[PDB]
Structure 1
Amino acid sequence: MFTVTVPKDLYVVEYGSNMTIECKFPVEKQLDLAALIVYWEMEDKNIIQFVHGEEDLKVQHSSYRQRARLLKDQLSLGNAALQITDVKLQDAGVYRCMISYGGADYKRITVKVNAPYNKINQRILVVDPVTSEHELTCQAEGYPKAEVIWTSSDHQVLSGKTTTTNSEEKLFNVTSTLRINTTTNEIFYCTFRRLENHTAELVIPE
């Protein structure tokens, strides 16, 4: 019998990275491309229409002409791999692969797009060197909204101001400002807690 397998049914890819999702099917010896058909679909869009040797670029949807392709070299291994480049949030969802090869079967695959706050840009502004008054800043992009937790070197917790906007856009820009009098050699921490957490360390200079 002919069974399409998705040994990996859940993909968690990071925003902006490349994605390659796979469907396995039985190939007992030399693959015959003339008897092979491969469909890749998402929602109501056709991504790959690989029929009898060649991709039909006419049926395939316009949003994927340049982003998506089927790794042909893999097919001889009984592996139908769809590659999509620079993944966005609207690439998350359900994909269907249909393999026909002397028998037909299809499977579904879930793709999750993760946009974490793990690139934290920090700023240390000296407002008043007399009183050692500083204005610390932590900023990051990610989805969804997140809150920022400021902690001292004794992991005390302090209050700061936080602003959240939108931008790549439909992503969230989160920036927090902490005004505080310090002690050089002191270490502060900004922690981005998303709705786990990533923390940037801010060392006050001499």
Structure 2
Amino acid sequence: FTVTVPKDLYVVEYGSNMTIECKFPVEKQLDLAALIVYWEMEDKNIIQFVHGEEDLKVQHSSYRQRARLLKDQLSLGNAALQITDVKLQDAGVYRCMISYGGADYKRITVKVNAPYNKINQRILVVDPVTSEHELTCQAEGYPKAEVIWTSSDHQVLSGKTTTTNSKREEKLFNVTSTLRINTTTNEIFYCTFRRLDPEENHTAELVIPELP
């Protein structure tokens, strides 16, 4: 009897649901009364599954209504722990321990980042005479990203970026950037939120509108 882990390392997106797994042998049908599944992180109980049910009294309040064991997956030999609304604080080392005709445990590392993939865009026609527009892209995330503005040519343009702590979610950074440029209807512009180490890019396409 050995518990095996598909993946040793998970990288998880802020605000999503996360599902991490420990697999264990199941040949016959699942005998619930002989099974124990236990999930833990930093010595806080997340899940204790015994006699076919979750033993909630033992669960750390920090996981109340955030965590569950996917029951269906058990018959297949998969202890799959799902945690909803992932926060930065959920990064760490998770330990599962399975007892079922034998006993074993594994450790799983979870990393959490907040990508700048939710990009709010807006475009102000400053002066139709000079065709001056002001394009703005904003997003929040962690760690800090820079904004690179490019033309449809992929030439790099000059912008003004402002970076502050998010007022919404505490540990995140709000990044808004503005490009001032003379241009025509249907021209295409890109605002790319870029973060290094490891490199990651999220880009919005902005099209110059036609107003009456």
* Superposition TM-score, scaled by structure 1 size: 0.90
Aligned-pair distance for 1:137?
Answer: 0.5
Q: Distance between the aligned counterparts of 1:11 and 1:197, measured in 2?
A: 19
Aligned-pair distance for 1:119?
Answer: 2.1
Aligned-pair distance for 1:173?
Answer: 1.2
The equivalent of 2:130 in structure 1 is 131
Deviation string, structure 1 residues 37-56 (Cα, Å, up to 9, x no partner): 11100112110112333322
In structure 2, relative to structure 1, the CA distance for the partners of 1:101 and 1:148 (3 Å cut) is same
Aligned-pair distance for 1:154?
Answer: 2.6
* Superposition TM-score, scaled by structure 2 size: 0.88
SS in 1 for 2:58: coil
Q: Distance between the aligned counterparts of 1:82 and 1:155, measured in 2?
A: 44
Q: Distance between the aligned counterparts of 1:150 and 1:73, measured in 2?
A: 47
In structure 2, relative to structure 1, the CA distance for the partners of 1:74 and 1:204 (3 Å cut) is closer
Q: Distance between the aligned counterparts of 1:4 and 1:88, measured in 2?
A: 27
User: Given the alignment, which residue of 197, 201, 204 partners 1:200?
Assistant: 204
Q: Which moved more, 1:36-45 or 1:122-131?
A: 122-131
SS in 1 for 2:57: coil
In structure 2, relative to structure 1, the CA distance for the partners of 1:122 and 1:28 (3 Å cut) is same
Q: Distance between the aligned counterparts of 1:85 and 1:101, measured in 2?
A: 27
SS in 2 for 1:205: coil
The equivalent of 1:186 in structure 2 is 187
What are the ranges of 5 or more consecutive residues in structure 1 without an aligned counterpart?
Answer: none
Number of equivalenced pairs = 205
In structure 2, relative to structure 1, the CA distance for the partners of 1:71 and 1:179 (3 Å cut) is same
Aligned-pair distance for 1:144?
Answer: 0.8
Aligned-pair distance for 1:181?
Answer: 2.3
CA RMSD, aligned part only? 1.8
In structure 2, relative to structure 1, the CA distance for the partners of 1:34 and 1:138 (3 Å cut) is same
Q: Distance between the aligned counterparts of 1:54 and 1:198, measured in 2?
A: 42
Aligned-pair distance for 1:68?
Answer: 0.6
What are the ranges of 5 or more consecutive residues in structure 2 without an aligned counterpart?
Answer: none
Deviation string, structure 1 residues 2-35 (Cα, Å, up to 9, x no partner): 1001122222332222122111111231332222
